[PDB]
């Protein structure tokens, strides 16, 4: 049972399929070019399943606990991109 | 080394092998002898 701490690397699974969020290696090509798909898939191995917490304004910090009010930005590790 | 990994992918994806390929293609302007045996020479800092 870790809690979650700004900073932290976390695997998020769909609760239907039972497969964790990743970013892809395929991207629709939208313009986008320099970006990526966010999808699903089986494997945990890799680091594109995993997504790291940063706090969305000034007053939190990296290292303060998660909260359920508080919004945040997630950097998928792989890709050194964001959910956008 | 999986920082050198992703900053080689990153730049991979930046800029296509096939537009380094064409701006290499891409031909100069050679100088050329005219009449009166002279050359006329293409500015350097107003072309490629």
């Known amino acids: 049972h870790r809690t979650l701490l700004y900073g932290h690397a976390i695997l998020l699974r769909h609760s239907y399929s039972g497969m964790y969020l990743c970013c892809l290696s395929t991207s629709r090509s939208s313009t986008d070019k320099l970006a990526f798909d966010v999808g699903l898939q089986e494997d945990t191995t890799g680091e594109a399943c995993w997504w790291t917490i940063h706090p969305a304004s000034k007053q939190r910090s990296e290292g303060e606990k998660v909260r359920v009010g508080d919004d945040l930005i997630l950097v998928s590790v792989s890709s050194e991109r964001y959910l956008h | 080394k999986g920082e050198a990994i992703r900053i080689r992918s ?11 390929v064409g701006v290499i293609s891409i031909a100069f302007q050679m100088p050329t002898i005219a009449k009166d045996g002279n050359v006329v020479e293409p500015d350097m800092s107003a072309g490629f």
């Open chain 2, 10 to 20: 990153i730049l991979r994806s930046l800029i296509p092998l096939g537009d380094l």
